[model samples]
Target: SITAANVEELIAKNIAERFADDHEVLGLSQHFRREGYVKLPGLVSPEVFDAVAAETHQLIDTHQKRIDIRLKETGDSPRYMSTVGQKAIATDGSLIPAVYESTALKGFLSRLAKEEVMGCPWDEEKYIITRQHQKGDTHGWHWGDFSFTVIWLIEAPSLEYGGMLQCIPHTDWNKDDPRVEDYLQKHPIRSYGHAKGDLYLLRSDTTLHRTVPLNADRTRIILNTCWASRADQQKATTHETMNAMF
Candidate 1:
């Protein structure tokens, strides 16, 4: 039910706000409905961003040449599309999961969900993070995910460098609008970006997001991750995954 209007709307409105006292999730949902992406700045410390940024940046420069990477999403695995999609990463990389599932990040997300007095509650188990950096010396769209994208912009991006995490402001997807594939098929060229430490929690499934090409001269490093309720309910390819995050 990725694109199911009823499910998306329900999850968007009630999931995390149930437990979150501060209404972060509710507020985010409201923003998501109206503006598409919720800007939850300072979700992570600038120091943590710097540390992780330095680490992931070095990893990109060191390992990009040794493997396959690109930015194109057509018929690609979550791993192989890293470069040129444009970026690089191990499909089963620990670094990515470490960003949220590993330590305080999980707790942080939990806190955000629990304290969201103005938002909905989410099924926490469904949380997942698909992360990547522009592989090698390339420039293009380095994306954030659907759950919530907490990117530690390791490297500053620029137009000349062709690297930027772009966004479509004052926009969103209606439950009955359309699927991402159809939309892309109709409008092939879409791109966007954000500033470093500009923590964003968007309705990835709804908001329009992408990264511009990273010119050969400049380096673009941004760690992306997403969060949701951790539920193990069976969801057939055709049905909604039973959400039990509360």
Candidate 2:
């Protein structure tokens, strides 16, 4: 009986009781505002993490709409090969719904982006499971579909080739800014590594981000969900009027 009303309370109760202190939550939001991204470790308990991790593998096997993306040009590296469409996360059980319906999660996201944030209530493009399957698999430098993104780390790349995430946090221009391409051409790139069960919250529309090419054979699996502001959702489409190039 996880209806919309009680589902939020359930998640908030779990967070308040088991996951984080009030100051920690407030501080993380503040840190995100200052730096545009923050990794919250142990955001979910081991039991919840384990359940979702097990479910992700199961759904990937049955998923049908996987896309292996890369630039149309010759010299580009292979981008993410991900499970999309409705079945990708629907078969993964309550994990997706729990994460998406949580009021506490959206509260943090709304405060971080200074917008009214929530799950994609009226769209089929809610969430996905991304797996980097080969040595060269990566997501290239690009703007995301939503104003903010939440990444649930279920598995990590091996220690040998160490997969990393790269981002340019400071953008002088936004999706609406005319000089966005100019800012992308001249900005600093910051890269970092992640651990299992860590949640990465970031402002995707304002930040230009990508995944460094995987140097190892190991696979990295993540549950990624994006949240648009009240402003962005009311637009015709998420990518409406935004720059299509990096």
Candidate 3:
């Protein structure tokens, strides 16, 4: 039986077993080094995934709001997505925090990245839930303030609906006067599609990415947990986009 107290324990055990082999870790690290992102399907058990999804749905009903504006910082990219920000999630309950703060999860990420991993110090950047429900909901092009992020998919629309992730790895974000259009013209954009219960690790600071706008009225929801590298922790970052949206 699963309980609130035991959820983190089970999740830790699951992650440990999933990536227990050194050979697998090396392979995943190589993929991440090349692509700046790696899809980790079913990182947590089905029961844990379901429980988190249920909690997220409830939080959405209470805390979510639509953000239909452009972020000037990242070249005025569109942000037509609904979100429940970190403040709400942190204060709500224990499950989400437990999973994010788990020592085992952090260790797994560190092993995969071949470096030390730590949680984001900023309260606003720690965790968030983003959902796309309308026909044109999209999280437009941008880079994260932190170095690493793990996204958990609770609900994902079919690829036909157009909610796939598009990215350009090994790119820089010039926030002062973002040259988004120039980058798009010069680089190749890679797109990836995922199903529910999927988790992905991303080198968010170096990867310029966005979720493709939905073509129809379908739903896509995801939970993002942000982590920081040693270099990231050393520098001071601003949360202009986060402040504007949330």
- The whole-model lDDT of each prediction reads 0.41, 0.63, 0.87
lDDT of 1: 0.41
Give the top-scoring candidate (TM-score).
3
Q: Is candidate 2 or candidate 3 better by lDDT?
A: 3
Stretches of candidate 3 off by over 4 Å are: 1-4
Tens-digit lDDT track of model 3 for 16-114: 778778898888888777888998775788888888888889889999999999988889899998999988998884578777887878888888788
Q: For candidate 3, which ten residues in a row score worst on lDDT?
A: 93-102
**How well does candidate 2 score on lDDT at residue 157?**
72
- The better candidate by TM-score, 2 or 3, is 3
Number of the top-ranking candidate, with lDDT as the measure = 3
How well does candidate 1 score on lDDT at residue 196?
Answer: 58
Q: Provide the TM-score for each candidate, comma-separated.
A: 0.49, 0.78, 0.96
Candidate 1 displacement at residue 19 in angstroms: 16
Q: What lDDT score is found at residue 21 in candidate 2?
A: 67
